[PDB]
Amino acid sequence: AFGHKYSEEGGLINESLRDQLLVTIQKTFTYTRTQAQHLFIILMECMK
């Protein structure tokens, strides 16, 4: 939900959310940026 509106042109997400996403992941999923990253990649890649 947060990835789709904070997306602009698909796989081009501004750092403001590149982290905001990573952090919500790092928070909601409690995934240390390590875990969060893999996810950030999948979300951006998929949501792209």
Binding site: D19, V23, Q26
Partner: peptide
Amino acid sequence: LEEVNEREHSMKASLQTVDIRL
């Protein structure tokens, strides 16, 4: 109240990012 809902969603995101920085 819809404007309250949108603004408080932004306030929670800013507070969460501030906690991660701290």
